Amino acid sequence: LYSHLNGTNEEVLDRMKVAELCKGWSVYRDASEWANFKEMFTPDANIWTTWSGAQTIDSFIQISKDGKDKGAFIMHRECGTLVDLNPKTQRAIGKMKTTITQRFEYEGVPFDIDCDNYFIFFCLKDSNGDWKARWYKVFYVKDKFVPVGVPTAENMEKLAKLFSKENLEQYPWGYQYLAVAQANLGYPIDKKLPTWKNELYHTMYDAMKEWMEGKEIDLHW
Amino acid sequence: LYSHLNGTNEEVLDRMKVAELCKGWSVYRDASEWANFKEMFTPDANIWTTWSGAQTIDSFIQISKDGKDKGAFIMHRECGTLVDLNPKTQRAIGKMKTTITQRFEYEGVPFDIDCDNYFIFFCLKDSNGDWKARWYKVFYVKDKFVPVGVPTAENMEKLAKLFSKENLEQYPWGYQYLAVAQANLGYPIDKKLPTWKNELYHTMYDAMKEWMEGKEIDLHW
Amino acid sequence: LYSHLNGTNEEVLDRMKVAELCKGWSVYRDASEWANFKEMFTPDANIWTTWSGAQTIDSFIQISKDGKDKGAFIMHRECGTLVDLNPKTQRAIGKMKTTITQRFEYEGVPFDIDCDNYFIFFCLKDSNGDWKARWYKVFYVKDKFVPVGVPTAENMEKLAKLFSKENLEQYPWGYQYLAVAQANLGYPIDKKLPTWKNELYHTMYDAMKEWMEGKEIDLHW
Ligand SMILES: O=[N+]([O-])c1ccc(O)c(O)c1
Ligand SMILES: O=[N+]([O-])c1ccc(O)c(O)c1
Ligand SMILES: O=[N+]([O-])c1ccc(O)c(O)c1
Ligand SMILES: [Co+2]
Ligand SMILES: [Co+2]
Ligand SMILES: [Co+2]
Ligand SMILES: [K+]
């Protein structure tokens, strides 16, 4: 019995504010607006990504800065955002569909990997009446290899060596291409993230329900 | 003389609520949140899609469930949503740009078809003061074949047999690739949907004007 | 010390109205809703694009109409929009991530170029209390060639002649593919637009700061 469509004017405005917060990932992180990014989160927020695994908000900002300085090139396309709001507990879940789009190079050939997903922001209204995210985790739905230059036969033969069936199969279906490409860059890959095929899908939805009820959770699996 | 930018605070809030409703297609349908999806619609709403043709909201939910259980894999990326509002008649048109992105397989090779379009939601404010969509139909703008794995020469030769010029030309320009791929799955294809090239473009815009004036319409062509 | 998340109800509503304004580019321009498009702008607004260079809002509308009549086919996918608001000066910056997606043909082979970017709208609240954009310019981040039909070896060999390394290198990294394709259509290309690699990145952020302080600017570089 959450608020998510229509509702009172105050409910609408709360859902607008939570929706903006989520979109800050796409707008602020891609642009390295790190103070604006940090404002989305509680001081003790925890984040998970494929390439970082579990992090605090502050540790995630530091390691992201480090990666960008080394040439990591990740962008997000926001693809539809709505909010489930519980006005009684001052809790909300922001559901922000995105494509993660990361630019890579192998043997001189540029390419993207594009991964469609849901970013899930576990939000609360704090002592100042401000919405903030305490937890962030992602459901990874599907991904693909994306040519950047004209995909001539010779360049695609080289890239096919990296995206072998054996390499893709090491990772959960939903982020296999992204994981292969990030691991080739040297990142550790968190293989215990939710998809739309594995069992962590259900652990995620259970944590979302408990959050909305006002309970404490812990996504450290 | 619709309300669509600026306006009074109540107009802004109405346009926010209608915009959220439209986005429910991308957020709720992709995630099989069927109760949240149904809440977007009047009880007697009618829907059209390429693969379903004309449906009621309830029949569409049932056949979508059936297709997902059989492995149909359709997602949406929301690409820009605004609202035309007539406060005098309590009517609105939600205009939600999207990409329909459906995952397919042919002779063991995965691929997507991505179709850019406008989703048009014909909305009214009901007896409870809630916005709901009574009619939904789409303008199909352009589409493309999307490789998923590295597009090596041999895999693309097999797929080229399915996307022959003769097969594409059976369908309205704007959704030809999507129609070929869905028909190969066994779906009937509705060939009488609006594009940006055919004459139904104008029938659509006429129905939108009459809806905003408070009149009854019927999209059953 | 801008307003961009949370804030007062009036601040939220101002940011909602500015966000809608920006999205009008994607919704209205693609659909040739030219009166709705013009409403986004002050009467004396100035616009820059890769294919038009500097224009007034009225001159841009005329030349866009001309190009569409000749078959130019540009669409936008909106990819995340937020607003920086200064309530003291009645000034705002709308930051709208997009993909510019333009459909082309070379030697009988269709293709898209997709360019990820930030659209920046320099907005003010006018005498009627309405938000309007006085300046519009873009940060071009990355781009790619996009096959439309199945990318068989023979069709990609022809297209590779157009997207030679020497041709791409004529343009700023961030919009090189888009520039090559638009120049092949006969458009002049503005090579002095901001990217995430060139020095105009900093001139842009400086103009945004001065705008928010209530000062006059001039993007005519
Ligand atoms: O913000 N990013 O860079 C992200 C977020 C989630 C991911 O799984 C990822 O690979 C990158
Ligand atoms: O919701 N979907 O699955 C849709 C909606 C419209 C379409 O034309 C379609 O092919 C699929
Ligand atoms: O509106 N458009 O057509 C645009 C806007 C910016 C661009 O740089 C462009 O190439 C096209
Ligand atoms: Co701030
Ligand atoms: Co509900
Ligand atoms: Co108007
Ligand atoms: K979007």
Author numbering:
A (entry chain A), B (entry chain A), C (entry chain A): 11 to 231
Paper text:
AGDC1 and PPP2 fit in none of these categories as both enzymes neither display cofactors bound to their active sites nor require the styrene motif or ATP hydrolysis. Instead, they act on the carboxyl-group directly attached to the aromatic ring. Intriguingly, these enzymes’ catalytic mechanism is a new type of decarboxylation mechanism combining acid–base catalysis by a His-Asp dyad with a sophisticated web of hydrogen bonds and a double tryptophan twisting clamp. The trimers of AGDC1 and PPP2 in the crystal structures represent the functional biological unit, evidenced by the size exclusion chromatography data and the extensive intermonomer buried surfaces and interactions.
